[PDB]
Amino acid sequence: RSKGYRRGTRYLFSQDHRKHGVAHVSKYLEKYEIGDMVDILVNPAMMKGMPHKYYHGRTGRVYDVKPRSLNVALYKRVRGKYVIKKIIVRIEHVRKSRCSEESQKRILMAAEMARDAESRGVVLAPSKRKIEGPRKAVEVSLDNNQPIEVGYEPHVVIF
């Protein structure tokens, strides 16, 4: 209700039950590059370099790397339009985003067989996905799997 920087964060900035302690070592060995997608995710045990609570749980795109830090760009809504924001966050509140895993292994195999198709000459680009359709057909059999005879079954009470 007052408006200090860490306003109203009793549950948002907390550890999660037998997951206390400082950042582990593999969190310092990741390699970040310009153009990556990243998730912001605050660790409340590290005091330095952390962003404002608005950005906890948002995904952004890297445009610069410092000796201890990153610069991230992303969108914020303010009543009627969007605006670009530039956040400075330390490497301990960030992790790689898996948000493009589906789309990358699909575009990879497409160019794979494209090279394996030009090797044979016969090629074709269009490989759009399709939504799931109506339903195919069924051939249910009763040689085994006898029916079970269900119904309305009068009502009972116990106290």
Partner: protein, 283 residues
């Protein structure tokens, strides 16, 4: 409070990391050690891990990745026995020779041994410079783990030997044997400790006056044929063989797979069911 033997004590317990519960890693020291710039993208840091066990001195050069460290070069104090030394590892002259052998053995793999010749063994504090026209000498940082940093410890003797070999490791002249509190440095007390001017002097002292103590303190020294006067020449003869061929002797024996006879097998599932039911029936 809930006390140690109760149910609520275990439901609420959080375990520490496995290398800390064993007492082998200090994790604040490890994080300050492997930190580097997110900018660099040139190559990963190299540390020189020096650990002294109950019977030997180990040296190895490591780099940190996301699923475990990797060893680039390795040297041991038990390899010194093919250069003439068998009279006592884990002493100050063995740590020096183990670090000296890993510096030469690392420069060879990079083809920088014709460059960066071995410095004179008995010089002063001489952190090495980079010669113009060719590659920088590889840079390495010292990592002593949970051993205390005291003036005159064996772990800073392995640091001194890797500098004389031609590596680029930073340090100051403290923690050596000639260092004076004012800030001066006498470079002959460190030469008298690299060679056995400490050991030979002690054997001669307690042999003349009490050979009953001399026979237990230096038992294996006598039965191996080491007499005190020739000690500072056996080391001097080993520091010139290392500087001429420091390479693995290349033996590649085959597998010890017959040792599978020594594991105790687990009861499967039904030897336990029979073991339970029989114990209830006759009860």
């Amino acid at each position: 409070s809930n006390a140690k033997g109760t149910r609520n004590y275990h439901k609420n317990f959080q375990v520490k990391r496995r290398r800390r519960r064993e007492g082998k890693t200090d994790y604040k020291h490890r994080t300050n050690m492997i930190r580097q710039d997110s900018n660099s993208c040139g190559s990963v840091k190299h540390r020189l891990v020096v650990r002294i066990t109950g019977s030997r001195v180990i040296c190895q050069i490591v780099a940190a990745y996301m699923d475990g460290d990797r060893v680039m070069v390795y040297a041991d104090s038990r390899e010194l026995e093919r250069y003439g030394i068998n009279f006592g590892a884990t002493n100050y002259s063995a740590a020096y020779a183990t670090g000296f052998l890993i510096g030469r053995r690392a420069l060879t793999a990079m083809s920088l041994d014709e460059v960066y010749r071995p410095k004179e063994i008995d010089g002063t504090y001489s952190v090495t410079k980079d010669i113009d026209g060719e590659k920088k000498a590889p840079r390495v940082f010292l990592d002593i783990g949970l051993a205390r940093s005291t003036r005159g410890a064996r772990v800073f003797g392995a640091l001194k030997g890797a500098s004389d070999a031609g590596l680029n490791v930073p340090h100051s002249a403290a923690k050596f044997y000639g260092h004076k509190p004012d800030g001066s440095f006498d470079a002959k007390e460190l030469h008298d400790r690299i060679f056995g001017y400490n050991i030979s002097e002690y054997m001669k002292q307690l042999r003349d006056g009490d050979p009953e103590k001399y026979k237990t303190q230096f038992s294996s020294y006598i039965k191996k044929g080491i007499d005190p006067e020739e000690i500072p020449r056996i080391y001097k003869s080993a520091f010139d063989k290392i500087a001429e061929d420091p390479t693995r002797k290349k033996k590649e024996t085959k597998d010890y797979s017959g040792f599978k006879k020594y594991k105790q097998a687990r009861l499967t599932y039904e030897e336990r069911a029979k073991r339970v039911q029989a114990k209830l029936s006759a009860a």
